[PDB]
Design a binder for these strands. Sequence first.
RNA 1: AUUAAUAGGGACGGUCGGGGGCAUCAGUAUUCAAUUGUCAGAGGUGAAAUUCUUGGAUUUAUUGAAGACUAACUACUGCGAAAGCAUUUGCCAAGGACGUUUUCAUUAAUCAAGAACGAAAAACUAUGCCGACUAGGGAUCGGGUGGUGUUUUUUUAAUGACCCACUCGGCACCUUACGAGGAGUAUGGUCGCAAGGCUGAAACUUAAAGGAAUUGACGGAA
Lengths: 120, 49, 25, 240, 188
Amino acid sequence: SQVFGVARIYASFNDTFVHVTDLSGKETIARVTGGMKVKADRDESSPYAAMLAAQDVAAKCKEVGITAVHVKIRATGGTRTKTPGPGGQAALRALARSGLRIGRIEDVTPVPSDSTRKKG
Amino acid sequence: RIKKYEQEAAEGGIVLSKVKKGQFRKIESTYKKDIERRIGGSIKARDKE
Amino acid sequence: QNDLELQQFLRESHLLSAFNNIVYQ
Amino acid sequence: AVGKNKRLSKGKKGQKKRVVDPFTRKEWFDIKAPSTFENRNVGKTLVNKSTGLKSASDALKGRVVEVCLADLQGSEDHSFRKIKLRVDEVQGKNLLTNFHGMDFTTDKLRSMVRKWQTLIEANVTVKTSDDYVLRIFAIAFTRKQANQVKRHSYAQSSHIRAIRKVISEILTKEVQGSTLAQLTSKLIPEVINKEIENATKDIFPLQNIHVRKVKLLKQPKFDVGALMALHGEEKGKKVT
Amino acid sequence: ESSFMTLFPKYRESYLKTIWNDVTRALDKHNIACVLDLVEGSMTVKTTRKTYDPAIILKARDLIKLLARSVPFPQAVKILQDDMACDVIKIGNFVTNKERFVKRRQRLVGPNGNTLKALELLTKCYILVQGNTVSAMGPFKGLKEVRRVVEDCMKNIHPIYHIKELMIKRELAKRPELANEDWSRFLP
RNA sequence: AUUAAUAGGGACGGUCGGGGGCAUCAGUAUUCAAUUGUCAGAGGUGAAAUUCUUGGAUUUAUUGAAGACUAACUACUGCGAAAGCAUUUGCCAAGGACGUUUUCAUUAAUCAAGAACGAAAAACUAUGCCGACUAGGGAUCGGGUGGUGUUUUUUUAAUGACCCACUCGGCACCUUACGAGGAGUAUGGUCGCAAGGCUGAAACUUAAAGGAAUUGACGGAA
């Protein structure tokens, strides 16, 4: 009765990618973007876009029949900052508030071993 | 207070404005509490010395 | 460093912080 | 960019209709971990369509899943360990997997690493007794004694080189003294790290010794015998 | 369930023990438990069976991370404020000569810290410079701006050019007559 | 056939080092290629725009490949004459210091001319008297001398780490005895800047249009 799916959240500094997925990581059960749910291009990372994108993926999750989430938070990382997005946080908020049983939270953002920067 | 501030910086390594040997530091303490006018930059007697 | 407004703002940068905790003009 | 200020590119010009309805054309299968661990039952997976039993085999045996070891073992502590698994066999809404790999987690790494001390890394690449080719990354940390008043306990060059050597020795020796099944049940209690402590006790004081990574290189040829004898012939209902 | 840890050094451990009521007060106010292990030399943050905010437990992880990197408790509650953000910027991966590296981060910090403090005012964040790491905490717009600035600063443009850019930008956006213009007619 | 200088070279014993050349093994990240996934934007900016994106962009999984770098550990530092110097294991060859009732026998030193070594947009607030230099203290790094217990272990494998006293040499830091024209003003001179009248427009009082001017103007009755 505890059916588990996962949620990859690429929370950038210019969009909030929310993406529920099967447990293996190939079947993309749903996907919405901040720039697909907010009106203008100016606010394509705001917590309003987070709440809306979260409600869309929540509707889709209760459409398919998943009962629990493993949320993986990811930032842009590597060359740019290692910091997540406010859309990321509010998305996790509104997903828990629409009521996906909070299975397991983890962050995996791409961290460089040694970055490709010009040692001038 | 300046010495304890300098020690906490150099123990948990921070950089700081390098000043000459005479004067003290310049902190938010001295800027807010306005202590320069009633103490000064440095010991003027030792400065002339 | 020849500018007039710039360096005055630069040395007042701690005073405005101290008496603030921006209206810098 | 759902708004009206957006100008016109190529963009959303010609688009087919949502008719396919993927999750009413899809199917739900269940996967099963080996029997060496405790909790065998784990997760679910989506089959695209039963027009291919070829397709069921293709997707559901090319799969690679990844669980956390608390989810796998029922550990009351969330025991900071991710296990990769690679599935190859299905028996009737119930897939049978094998083992693929195992990494630590990034938060635990940034928890381990400190400031006034020394981190040691090592890597080995062995062939197992059941013909698997594996690569193991192990890490270690120096510590200070209680009597010490010095605020750092570094190790010198002969120390670090001898340390990496002896841990490489115990790594290759133990992985070639055991199979992959007993190797997995040997990495379950982390008794290899306790062995490394009570073996390199005569070199240098250590506080945190860990195997960071386990990666596969080459897989042997699949045996239904081995996989099934690990996991611990069916008849139907006469449709008229 | 959800739990995280972070190591610290001892000279901060004194400060930790002297202030430790305040962190556990704010965090059980957010229903976040925190504890402290001395021989481990570590802090721990965990949730309980009543916690209802994943954003705030990620925030508490950021709290112990910042407090390990030795920022005081006013800045700690400023990051546990909701719409703020920590951000770490490394500079050690830019330049070749060590002495040029030293003089360049001194050019950053400036005489009487003045360049740093003007930057902090104009972005409403807080900066702190530690050798090869520079920590910053504040709102996201200021953080993006300071990231661009410090990367060009350990490149070879000057922070004074950037400070003039910042004040001109903030004024030109303050006057609510222009939102279409690319403003490069005004920036040099 | 004098010594062997707290002069110099040399050997040996244990060491030390992100010192050097040669391959070698590996971490991730990025870029491209290919495989599958759901189908509607992605990028960047203050907001924009260029660009990519029904031949399925971005994104999730899989490998694959190339070309750079070896983070967190990383600094109160080590090593090199300087620039420089950070994964692994070998191979080769140098070098400092320690310690020796070891070797020679003053072979040392300051260097102008000559030679070797030096990635080669760079820089932009930094500055402390100086010394043929007296004492010092806490820290480190490297070696030896001794004690002491831990930690260790024990017929078997490298007799290592820590406490403290002593002892040499470094990098640093901290207190100390001592000594060798800028300004502004004025300008009857000199060289330059040069000033305005509606515009057409001048030999023509000269058209349209243009801005300026903007409540058009002209008479009666109370």
